[PDB]
């Protein structure tokens, strides 16, 4: 019910819940979490920022999580996000 | 950048560290959430690991790393700087 900076190993299912929360404060925190993940991986496992709007990255993360089975949602959020982005925008 | 928001892609070290030290507890908490996204994305991979370490120890080492950073390096991106802080201190293996 609340995303905080102690939530290490954030699971995908909680991330996605906050990410689509009716509470826009939790939505914004989930998106700032996603921002630390993107900034940490961009140009390493997926490419790139001047090729893509942040809204495009957020919508692609949304679609990716929205299609995921619960078996996979229960895994860690960050590697799932990074997987969204890698398959779709690889560096090669 | 007067407030940390999720539009802040490629957040510079200078902005991250300002928010991370802010007197506004809410800005401070957002900066710590940006940090959590970076920890989650890099843990077990460039640095190790969440068991023996509480979040606060991690947060304090990141703070000390930034405090000692030469001014020249604050233009670098916050995420790789946070990763360097943790890799040096909590190397894998």
Numbering used by the authors:
A (entry chain B): 32 to 123
B (entry chain A): 31 to 123
Sentences from the paper on this structure:
Some Gram-negative bacteria target their competitors by exploiting the type VI secretion system to extrude toxic effector proteins. To prevent self-harm, these bacteria also produce highly specific immunity proteins that neutralize these antagonistic effectors. The opportunistic pathogen Serratia marcescens has recently been shown to utilize T6-dependent secretion of two family 4 amidases, Ssp1 and Ssp2, to mediate antibacterial activity. In S. marcescens, the resistance-associated proteins Rap1a and Rap2a neutralize Ssp1 and Ssp2, respectively.
The Rap1a subunit displays a compact globular structure constructed from five α-helices that assemble to form the highly stable symmetric dimer that constitutes the asymmetric unit. This is consistent with the size-exclusion chromatography data, which identified that only a dimer was observed in solution. The NCS is highly conserved, with an r.m.s.d. of 0.6 Å for a least-squares overlay of 96 Cα positions. A disulfide bond is formed between Cys78 (in the α2–α3 loop) and Cys122 in the C-terminal region. This interaction appears to be crucial to stabilizing the subunit fold since it helps position α2, α3 and α5 close to each other and these segments of secondary structure provide the side chains that form the hydrophobic core of the subunit. During initial recombinant expression tests it was noted that soluble protein was only produced in E. coli Rosetta-gami (DE3) cells, a strain that promotes the formation of disulfide bonds in the cytoplasm and so mimics what might occur in the oxidative environment of the periplasm. This suggests that the covalent bond is necessary for correct folding to occur and for stability of the Rap1a fold and dimeric quaternary structure. Interactions involving residues in α2 make the major contribution to dimer formation. Each subunit contributes a surface area of 1130 Å2 to the dimer interface, which is 20% of the solvent-accessible surface area (ASA) of the subunit (5700 Å2). We therefore conclude that the Rap1a fold has not been observed previously, making it a unique member of the T6SS immunity family of proteins. In Rap1a, the segment linking α2 and α3, residues 74–84, shows high average B factors (temperature factors; 76.4 Å2) compared with the overall average B factor (31.5 Å2) and relatively diffuse electron density.
